[PDB]
Amino acid sequence: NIKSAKKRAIQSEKARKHNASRRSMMRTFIKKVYAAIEAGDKAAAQKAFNEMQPIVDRQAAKGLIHKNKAARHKANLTAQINKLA
Amino acid sequence: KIRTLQGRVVSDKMEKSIVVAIERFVKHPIYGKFIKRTTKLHVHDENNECGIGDVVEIRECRPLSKTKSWTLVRVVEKAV
Amino acid sequence: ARYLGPKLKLSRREGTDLFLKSGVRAIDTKCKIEQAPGQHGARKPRLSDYGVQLREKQKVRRIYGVLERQFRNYYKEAARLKGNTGENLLALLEGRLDNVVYRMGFGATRAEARQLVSHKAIMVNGRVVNIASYQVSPNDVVSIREKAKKQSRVKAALELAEQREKPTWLEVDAGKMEGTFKRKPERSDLSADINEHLIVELYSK
Amino acid sequence: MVTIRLARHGAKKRPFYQVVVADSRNARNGRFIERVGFFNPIASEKEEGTRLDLDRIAHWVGQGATISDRVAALIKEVNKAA
Amino acid sequence: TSYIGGEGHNLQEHSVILIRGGRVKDLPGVRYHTVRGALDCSGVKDRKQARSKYGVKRPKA
RNA sequence: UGAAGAGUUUGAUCAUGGCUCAGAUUGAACGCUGGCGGCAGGCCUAACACAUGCAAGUCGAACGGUAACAGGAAGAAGCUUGCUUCUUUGCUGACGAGUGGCGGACGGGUGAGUAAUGUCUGGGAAACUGCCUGAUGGAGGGGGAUAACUACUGGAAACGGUAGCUAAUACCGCAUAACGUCGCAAGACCAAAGAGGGGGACCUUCGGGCCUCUUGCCAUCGGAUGUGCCCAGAUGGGAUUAGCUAGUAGGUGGGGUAACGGCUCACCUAGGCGACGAUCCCUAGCUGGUCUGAGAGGAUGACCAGCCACACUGGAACUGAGACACGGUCCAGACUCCUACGGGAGGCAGCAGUGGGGAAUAUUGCACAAUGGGCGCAAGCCUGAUGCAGCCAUGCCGCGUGUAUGAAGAAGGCCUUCGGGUUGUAAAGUACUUUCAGCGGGGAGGAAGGGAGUAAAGUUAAUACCUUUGCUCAUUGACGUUACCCGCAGAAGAAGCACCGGCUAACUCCGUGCCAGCAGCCGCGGUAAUACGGAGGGUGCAAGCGUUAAUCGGAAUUACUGGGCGUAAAGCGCACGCAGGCGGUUUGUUAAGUCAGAUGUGAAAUCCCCGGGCUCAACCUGGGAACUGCAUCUGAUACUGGCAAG
């Protein structure tokens, strides 16, 4: 019907695709941390986290996540690394 | 410290949790007889340190599990 | 609203002179007071404990021309006031402008007062009022507008008033033909044979 | 968006407005927070046309409340008068 | 069953009628009392008093 | 300020006991009738199907731009001697389509679902909060794009695909660095945007920089507001529903959300819920309130307002501060329709209207002038919200339909002892009045504001600009030929409806002859019948008046206030007894019940009171009272409960 809705629709499809790419990118730099947590290496997990920390915190700043889910993923991975070794 | 609802624990079996039964008068709204209405309510007890039948002093906390929102502050009676 | 009325078969039923007509009409002079209101003559009236308050409620309604809707509204706003419910009814019926323009001495019957009021003639507190139900508050000064000061009626109907009694809760300066409802009428000076404690049981069923 | 708009409450052809403090998202004759004074547009010294309770308006305005269009005039037409 | 009271009768076997209520006291359970002169059932003949309770309306008079 | 009874079982009466009636109210309907006007309501049924029109946009001060329109600018030309026919330019106002921002989550509808983590009251913590507000800072630099647009370009269509094109406050990196997050601490890591207005003064590749103005931007901390979550109590019928429950109850850990939590997963414990009614079934949106009632209570929940839930039926999620989203997306199904049959399109529980169903419920209006809302720097656009109009006696309120005087009681009717009485001063006639409707002219108030100039110490440039004020000028009303006022007519246009045996105010005559019929009850009709039908007369109410339906009352007829059980209905056939319910007496203690006081809260409107404004009233409205509650705190300690001693 309305001219608004059929622009907000294509706009939301574009934003869907772009947001989806960002979140399925960050869900790789968290699973790279997990694949080292289960691997039981302190150092490899340390690099995995020190590379995660921008990406999960970068878009929490300006997008998908916001500060509380970024805080959660930082915290409950620092905690898991600490008690790894 | 809100009103620290005194109650008598019913069943301390369940792990780190109890069942405290509060008892209350209330005048019957339509007939006027002071009836005794119990208020059973799950309480989180952290050490299983209270046995059936001793009056405890419980408090409102954030929900701690599905249907468990009370913890006690201190016990004022021994089970036996 | 007023319904053109039962004429004198009105007052014949109640017995007492209910003033729809005023003049030499007090004596019979073609009125035939209580010969018969109709088909049967002086049939003995076997009124029940009910009929003798319907009779008085419609003595009161039909003195003033009030009706069942307005008379029950008057009943309710007389029964929510403070004090004697019956004297409250008579007070708020006596303060009615249709009435007061009569008790002033203007006109000759409350139908004439109801018509003068409705025809802009009576003007109270300096602003024209043509509602007959306007409850005249005390200390008001009722008048007659300039157009109707000498119209046809109040020059003679006023002379038909001095032989009549002077109601003592309002004063009439007939020489200037403007009056002042000075204070609230009471039961005692409102010298009527009306038993309030029949009406009040009629409505308080 | 707490606002100090007006709600129309009087009968037909004769509007009466309460100066209400309510947020924007509510319909003007929906919910509200505080009722600080009224406005009766009718004139010719029937009565006071406005009573307004300036201290609660000043409080709300200093608390982040957007004082609306007609009521803005209502404020100073009081202050200019007194 | 509905009673067709009035001063005379005018219905048929398929005319649509407007049932009313108000039990009749004689028949063993005719407790609806058809309205006169509202739906396709005519009024009553030459009837002057209580004329509203039947479907006839103001002879010139 | 508060409280009524009557009839009816009998030859008859005292009681029981139902049944009926008299009051008030309705989102009413129907029957007969009808003049106004004010205020207010108006599909209660099929959450059935929906023609057709409107119901959601805005900003060119974000940016490519020109699709038009206009201001034109330039140019070629008509001379048309300086006027205007043409070709380019977005150069300008401005603006279609496009990207972008914000709003489509509000406002508006409905009550299907929901019997309860939904609603109401009262507390609480483990949370976010676009717009608005205070404080603090930051606000450098770079990139790759893609619609627009161009040109091909399939598809009947719906709708696309190729090749170039292109900017931005779009998008993303970089330096960026806490008052941030993670972390014990160290350390680590994280953002952003420009835009206009005038350029004083200067520079200017004359881009603009640069000064300045305004506004926007990023980060953090508050605020307010909104929302999420939690707990307790209270919220329908059925026990002819007595057992239910395995992520089910809890605990470890992961994982998950803004946030706690079985919210989810692995594991372990074997619980949890239930007579104080779980589970199951039926019905139902919930509240302030409405009606009724002396009141307790009962019945309700259309209007108005707060919360909830749904948006053709059923799944899901995206985008976003906020949705699982009426006029948004994907998917199914039923449909309705286009279809070239290969495929597509739609959702009035918005407004008005249509078909249907129904006893029953309205216009396919006017304006955004007010109030509010969205976007905007503002002018402004948009608003089926809203304001008003239309229809409808649906209600409530106010008015009118004439007023006086008038007999030999005019005739004429009714009856009639024929005497007359009655209809009845009623009529006619007599003098007069014009309120409403009619005609004519006067005629507010709802309009505050916004526009154009004007002083500014404000701001810096000093006036520039902007800002607010102050002043001046002109300007905005749908309704609406407004209310109201004044002139002109003449009684000129304005009365019905039920009822009359008792209950109940109000009876006579005739026809009928258990027939036609009536009827709320008692009961009438079989030769007068004040009960049916007609006439005259009266009674009651009056633009109404009757009937049906519905609720409460009366009904003390579910009885808490406020009933009973020998014989009227009603003591289990009798015991024992768990749970339950009650508990002698003195002292001490507590202070849970109780009581007093206090503090918050009990939305607004409703209800009541004293007012006030509409010529009165309905109606509107100020202030109070009231909301009989809940929670917290402080006292008392007689009575009830606890604990102890007897």
Tab-separated table of all heavy atoms in Angstrom, chain F residues 514-528:
chain	number	residue	atom	x	y	z
F	514	C	P	-74.156	-17.937	24.338
F	514	C	OP1	-74.316	-18.300	22.912
F	514	C	OP2	-74.978	-18.609	25.371
F	514	C	O5'	-72.632	-18.121	24.742
F	514	C	C5'	-72.168	-19.377	25.208
F	514	C	C4'	-70.668	-19.463	25.180
F	514	C	O4'	-70.124	-18.560	26.177
F	514	C	C3'	-70.112	-20.839	25.516
F	514	C	O3'	-68.880	-21.014	24.828
F	514	C	C2'	-69.841	-20.723	27.006
F	514	C	O2'	-68.891	-21.633	27.506
F	514	C	C1'	-69.343	-19.293	27.094
F	514	C	N1	-69.462	-18.679	28.417
F	514	C	C2	-68.535	-19.040	29.392
F	514	C	O2	-67.677	-19.884	29.111
F	514	C	N3	-68.600	-18.475	30.614
F	514	C	C4	-69.539	-17.569	30.871
F	514	C	N4	-69.569	-17.030	32.091
F	514	C	C5	-70.490	-17.174	29.886
F	514	C	C6	-70.418	-17.744	28.678
F	515	C	P	-68.891	-21.434	23.283
F	515	C	OP1	-70.158	-22.161	23.037
F	515	C	OP2	-67.597	-22.078	22.965
F	515	C	O5'	-68.965	-20.053	22.494
F	515	C	C5'	-69.208	-20.057	21.098
F	515	C	C4'	-69.276	-18.674	20.498
F	515	C	O4'	-70.117	-17.794	21.266
F	515	C	C3'	-67.979	-17.902	20.361
F	515	C	O3'	-67.237	-18.352	19.240
F	515	C	C2'	-68.456	-16.452	20.212
F	515	C	O2'	-68.674	-16.137	18.846
F	515	C	C1'	-69.818	-16.466	20.915
F	515	C	N1	-69.952	-15.570	22.083
F	515	C	C2	-70.422	-14.268	21.863
F	515	C	O2	-70.660	-13.896	20.715
F	515	C	N3	-70.614	-13.429	22.885
F	515	C	C4	-70.358	-13.846	24.109
F	515	C	N4	-70.546	-12.994	25.112
F	515	C	C5	-69.886	-15.165	24.366
F	515	C	C6	-69.705	-16.008	23.339
F	516	A	P	-65.660	-18.084	19.117
F	516	A	OP1	-65.210	-18.704	17.846
F	516	A	OP2	-65.006	-18.490	20.370
F	516	A	O5'	-65.539	-16.503	18.975
F	516	A	C5'	-65.798	-15.876	17.731
F	516	A	C4'	-65.990	-14.393	17.883
F	516	A	O4'	-67.022	-14.123	18.862
F	516	A	C3'	-64.797	-13.619	18.393
F	516	A	O3'	-63.849	-13.359	17.377
F	516	A	C2'	-65.443	-12.366	18.955
F	516	A	O2'	-65.804	-11.488	17.903
F	516	A	C1'	-66.724	-12.935	19.555
F	516	A	N9	-66.554	-13.256	20.977
F	516	A	C8	-66.034	-14.399	21.504
F	516	A	N7	-65.996	-14.399	22.807
F	516	A	C5	-66.517	-13.172	23.155
F	516	A	C6	-66.732	-12.570	24.391
F	516	A	N6	-66.437	-13.171	25.532
F	516	A	N1	-67.263	-11.342	24.424
F	516	A	C2	-67.542	-10.769	23.259
F	516	A	N3	-67.383	-11.228	22.023
F	516	A	C4	-66.860	-12.454	22.041
F	517	G	P	-62.328	-13.822	17.562
F	517	G	OP1	-61.633	-13.694	16.263
F	517	G	OP2	-62.317	-15.120	18.271
F	517	G	O5'	-61.725	-12.736	18.545
F	517	G	C5'	-61.393	-13.075	19.876
F	517	G	C4'	-61.842	-12.004	20.823
F	517	G	O4'	-63.104	-12.374	21.426
F	517	G	C3'	-60.949	-11.764	22.012
F	517	G	O3'	-59.792	-11.023	21.700
F	517	G	C2'	-61.899	-11.085	22.980
F	517	G	O2'	-62.185	-9.760	22.565
F	517	G	C1'	-63.147	-11.916	22.759
F	517	G	N9	-63.151	-13.088	23.641
F	517	G	C8	-62.914	-14.381	23.270
F	517	G	N7	-62.971	-15.199	24.272
F	517	G	C5	-63.261	-14.391	25.360
F	517	G	C6	-63.440	-14.713	26.716
F	517	G	O6	-63.383	-15.817	27.248
F	517	G	N1	-63.713	-13.612	27.479
F	517	G	C2	-63.797	-12.355	27.002
F	517	G	N2	-64.073	-11.406	27.888
F	517	G	N3	-63.637	-12.033	25.746
F	517	G	C4	-63.367	-13.092	24.987
F	518	C	P	-58.388	-11.463	22.329
F	518	C	OP1	-57.296	-10.910	21.503
F	518	C	OP2	-58.444	-12.914	22.580
F	518	C	O5'	-58.382	-10.737	23.738
F	518	C	C5'	-58.882	-9.422	23.860
F	518	C	C4'	-59.223	-9.108	25.282
F	518	C	O4'	-60.203	-10.042	25.779
F	518	C	C3'	-58.095	-9.230	26.276
F	518	C	O3'	-57.217	-8.127	26.233
F	518	C	C2'	-58.841	-9.359	27.598
F	518	C	O2'	-59.256	-8.083	28.063
F	518	C	C1'	-60.086	-10.138	27.180
F	518	C	N1	-60.061	-11.556	27.590
F	518	C	C2	-60.250	-11.854	28.928
F	518	C	O2	-60.405	-10.926	29.725
F	518	C	N3	-60.249	-13.135	29.336
F	518	C	C4	-60.078	-14.097	28.454
F	518	C	N4	-60.091	-15.345	28.899
F	518	C	C5	-59.898	-13.824	27.083
F	518	C	C6	-59.902	-12.552	26.693
F	519	A	P	-55.645	-8.351	26.426
F	519	A	OP1	-54.985	-7.032	26.363
F	519	A	OP2	-55.212	-9.468	25.557
F	519	A	O5'	-55.514	-8.878	27.913
F	519	A	C5'	-55.899	-8.085	29.019
F	519	A	C4'	-55.828	-8.904	30.272
F	519	A	O4'	-56.855	-9.922	30.226
F	519	A	C3'	-54.539	-9.682	30.434
F	519	A	O3'	-53.502	-8.907	30.999
F	519	A	C2'	-54.967	-10.872	31.275
F	519	A	O2'	-55.112	-10.497	32.634
F	519	A	C1'	-56.355	-11.141	30.715
F	519	A	N9	-56.328	-12.087	29.592
F	519	A	C8	-56.154	-11.791	28.272
F	519	A	N7	-56.190	-12.821	27.479
F	519	A	C5	-56.412	-13.865	28.340
F	519	A	C6	-56.554	-15.225	28.109
F	519	A	N6	-56.486	-15.770	26.897
F	519	A	N1	-56.761	-16.013	29.174
F	519	A	C2	-56.827	-15.453	30.382
F	519	A	N3	-56.707	-14.179	30.724
F	519	A	C4	-56.497	-13.435	29.639
F	520	G	P	-51.989	-9.108	30.512
F	520	G	OP1	-51.285	-7.817	30.686
F	520	G	OP2	-51.999	-9.767	29.191
F	520	G	O5'	-51.407	-10.174	31.536
F	520	G	C5'	-50.011	-10.332	31.726
F	520	G	C4'	-49.678	-10.393	33.194
F	520	G	O4'	-49.605	-9.056	33.728
F	520	G	C3'	-50.703	-11.095	34.062
F	520	G	O3'	-50.494	-12.492	34.091
F	520	G	C2'	-50.506	-10.444	35.415
F	520	G	O2'	-49.384	-11.010	36.057
F	520	G	C1'	-50.132	-9.025	35.028
F	520	G	N9	-51.252	-8.067	35.049
F	520	G	C8	-51.855	-7.547	33.946
F	520	G	N7	-52.785	-6.693	34.219
F	520	G	C5	-52.778	-6.633	35.589
F	520	G	C6	-53.578	-5.859	36.439
F	520	G	O6	-54.470	-5.065	36.137
F	520	G	N1	-53.255	-6.078	37.758
F	520	G	C2	-52.294	-6.939	38.203
F	520	G	N2	-52.141	-7.011	39.531
F	520	G	N3	-51.542	-7.671	37.407
F	520	G	C4	-51.836	-7.459	36.122
F	521	C	P	-51.712	-13.500	34.344
F	521	C	OP1	-51.166	-14.871	34.239
F	521	C	OP2	-52.849	-13.078	33.499
F	521	C	O5'	-52.107	-13.267	35.867
F	521	C	C5'	-51.438	-13.971	36.902
F	521	C	C4'	-51.899	-13.514	38.256
F	521	C	O4'	-51.822	-12.071	38.312
F	521	C	C3'	-53.346	-13.809	38.595
F	521	C	O3'	-53.551	-15.125	39.070
F	521	C	C2'	-53.663	-12.738	39.619
F	521	C	O2'	-53.065	-13.052	40.864
F	521	C	C1'	-52.906	-11.557	39.045
F	521	C	N1	-53.731	-10.733	38.141
F	521	C	C2	-54.553	-9.811	38.733
F	521	C	O2	-54.541	-9.775	39.959
F	521	C	N3	-55.317	-9.004	37.999
F	521	C	C4	-55.270	-9.099	36.691
F	521	C	N4	-56.049	-8.284	35.996
F	521	C	C5	-54.439	-10.038	36.032
F	521	C	C6	-53.686	-10.831	36.790
F	522	C	P	-54.783	-15.985	38.514
F	522	C	OP1	-54.444	-17.419	38.642
F	522	C	OP2	-55.180	-15.397	37.215
F	522	C	O5'	-55.967	-15.665	39.516
F	522	C	C5'	-55.716	-15.448	40.891
F	522	C	C4'	-56.775	-14.569	41.508
F	522	C	O4'	-56.541	-13.175	41.171
F	522	C	C3'	-58.194	-14.799	41.037
F	522	C	O3'	-58.810	-15.966	41.547
F	522	C	C2'	-58.864	-13.505	41.442
F	522	C	O2'	-59.040	-13.477	42.844
F	522	C	C1'	-57.778	-12.500	41.075
F	522	C	N1	-57.953	-11.995	39.693
F	522	C	C2	-58.772	-10.887	39.478
F	522	C	O2	-59.303	-10.353	40.455
F	522	C	N3	-58.963	-10.416	38.234
F	522	C	C4	-58.368	-11.020	37.219
F	522	C	N4	-58.572	-10.525	36.000
F	522	C	C5	-57.544	-12.159	37.391
F	522	C	C6	-57.368	-12.604	38.630
F	523	G	P	-59.213	-17.143	40.526
F	523	G	OP1	-59.808	-18.272	41.272
F	523	G	OP2	-58.040	-17.409	39.667
F	523	G	O5'	-60.322	-16.488	39.592
F	523	G	C5'	-61.390	-15.721	40.133
F	523	G	C4'	-61.626	-14.460	39.339
F	523	G	O4'	-60.497	-14.204	38.464
F	523	G	C3'	-62.794	-14.471	38.377
F	523	G	O3'	-64.060	-14.348	38.986
F	523	G	C2'	-62.435	-13.328	37.446
F	523	G	O2'	-62.596	-12.081	38.101
F	523	G	C1'	-60.945	-13.560	37.285
F	523	G	N9	-60.650	-14.405	36.115
F	523	G	C8	-60.423	-15.748	36.097
F	523	G	N7	-60.183	-16.201	34.900
F	523	G	C5	-60.270	-15.090	34.075
F	523	G	C6	-60.107	-14.954	32.672
F	523	G	O6	-59.848	-15.819	31.835
F	523	G	N1	-60.273	-13.650	32.244
F	523	G	C2	-60.557	-12.610	33.069
F	523	G	N2	-60.683	-11.410	32.501
F	523	G	N3	-60.710	-12.723	34.371
F	523	G	C4	-60.555	-13.980	34.813
F	524	C	P	-65.356	-14.782	38.151
F	524	C	OP1	-66.504	-14.950	39.066
F	524	C	OP2	-64.979	-15.861	37.211
F	524	C	O5'	-65.643	-13.522	37.239
F	524	C	C5'	-66.194	-13.690	35.951
F	524	C	C4'	-65.975	-12.474	35.100
F	524	C	O4'	-64.627	-12.488	34.577
F	524	C	C3'	-66.848	-12.397	33.871
F	524	C	O3'	-68.123	-11.860	34.156
F	524	C	C2'	-66.024	-11.548	32.930
F	524	C	O2'	-66.110	-10.183	33.294
F	524	C	C1'	-64.621	-12.036	33.250
F	524	C	N1	-64.236	-13.174	32.408
F	524	C	C2	-64.044	-12.991	31.057
F	524	C	O2	-64.205	-11.863	30.590
F	524	C	N3	-63.699	-14.042	30.294
F	524	C	C4	-63.535	-15.232	30.849
F	524	C	N4	-63.190	-16.245	30.068
F	524	C	C5	-63.718	-15.446	32.231
F	524	C	C6	-64.064	-14.392	32.967
F	525	G	P	-69.424	-12.770	33.959
F	525	G	OP1	-70.612	-11.938	34.267
F	525	G	OP2	-69.210	-14.044	34.683
F	525	G	O5'	-69.416	-13.080	32.401
F	525	G	C5'	-69.440	-12.014	31.470
F	525	G	C4'	-69.483	-12.503	30.048
F	525	G	O4'	-68.157	-12.836	29.583
F	525	G	C3'	-70.269	-13.763	29.776
F	525	G	O3'	-71.665	-13.562	29.800
F	525	G	C2'	-69.727	-14.186	28.421
F	525	G	O2'	-70.305	-13.416	27.378
F	525	G	C1'	-68.254	-13.798	28.559
F	525	G	N9	-67.433	-14.970	28.884
F	525	G	C8	-67.020	-15.508	30.068
F	525	G	N7	-66.314	-16.592	29.893
F	525	G	C5	-66.286	-16.773	28.518
F	525	G	C6	-65.697	-17.758	27.692
F	525	G	O6	-65.032	-18.747	28.004
F	525	G	N1	-65.936	-17.527	26.350
F	525	G	C2	-66.648	-16.476	25.855
F	525	G	N2	-66.793	-16.395	24.532
F	525	G	N3	-67.203	-15.562	26.604
F	525	G	C4	-66.980	-15.781	27.903
F	526	G	P	-72.461	-13.742	31.179
F	526	G	OP1	-72.941	-12.399	31.582
F	526	G	OP2	-71.606	-14.512	32.114
F	526	G	O5'	-73.674	-14.697	30.799
F	526	G	C5'	-74.162	-14.754	29.470
F	526	G	C4'	-74.916	-16.034	29.196
F	526	G	O4'	-74.047	-17.017	28.585
F	526	G	C3'	-75.514	-16.772	30.386
F	526	G	O3'	-76.701	-16.163	30.881
F	526	G	C2'	-75.728	-18.177	29.819
F	526	G	O2'	-76.926	-18.240	29.064
F	526	G	C1'	-74.551	-18.310	28.845
F	526	G	N9	-73.485	-19.191	29.352
F	526	G	C8	-72.998	-20.279	28.677
F	526	G	N7	-72.072	-20.921	29.324
F	526	G	C5	-71.941	-20.219	30.506
F	526	G	C6	-71.081	-20.457	31.601
F	526	G	O6	-70.245	-21.355	31.738
F	526	G	N1	-71.264	-19.517	32.603
F	526	G	C2	-72.163	-18.485	32.553
F	526	G	N2	-72.186	-17.679	33.621
F	526	G	N3	-72.969	-18.250	31.534
F	526	G	C4	-72.815	-19.155	30.551
F	527	U	P	-77.390	-16.609	32.269
F	527	U	OP1	-76.491	-16.375	33.420
F	527	U	OP2	-77.984	-17.947	32.086
F	527	U	O5'	-78.595	-15.581	32.434
F	527	U	C5'	-79.506	-15.337	31.368
F	527	U	C4'	-78.966	-14.287	30.452
F	527	U	O4'	-79.635	-14.354	29.188
F	527	U	C3'	-79.076	-12.845	30.933
F	527	U	O3'	-77.801	-12.232	30.927
F	527	U	C2'	-79.967	-12.170	29.895
F	527	U	O2'	-79.573	-10.851	29.588
F	527	U	C1'	-79.786	-13.062	28.691
F	527	U	N1	-80.889	-13.085	27.744
F	527	U	C2	-81.246	-11.926	27.135
F	527	U	O2	-80.746	-10.854	27.387
F	527	U	N3	-82.259	-12.054	26.235
F	527	U	C4	-82.903	-13.210	25.876
F	527	U	O4	-83.800	-13.157	25.039
F	527	U	C5	-82.439	-14.383	26.542
F	527	U	C6	-81.457	-14.279	27.430
F	528	A	P	-77.396	-11.292	32.151
F	528	A	OP1	-76.339	-11.829	33.030
F	528	A	OP2	-78.700	-10.944	32.709
F	528	A	O5'	-76.874	-9.982	31.461
F	528	A	C5'	-77.725	-8.866	31.314
F	528	A	C4'	-76.952	-7.606	31.579
F	528	A	O4'	-77.314	-6.609	30.616
F	528	A	C3'	-77.103	-6.952	32.957
F	528	A	O3'	-75.836	-6.839	33.589
F	528	A	C2'	-77.662	-5.557	32.644
F	528	A	O2'	-77.139	-4.537	33.456
F	528	A	C1'	-77.234	-5.360	31.216
F	528	A	N9	-78.058	-4.470	30.442
F	528	A	C8	-79.103	-3.656	30.757
F	528	A	N7	-79.529	-2.985	29.703
F	528	A	C5	-78.689	-3.391	28.657
F	528	A	C6	-78.577	-3.075	27.279
F	528	A	N6	-79.367	-2.221	26.626
F	528	A	N1	-77.605	-3.685	26.560
F	528	A	C2	-76.792	-4.554	27.165
F	528	A	N3	-76.792	-4.926	28.437
F	528	A	C4	-77.779	-4.311	29.123
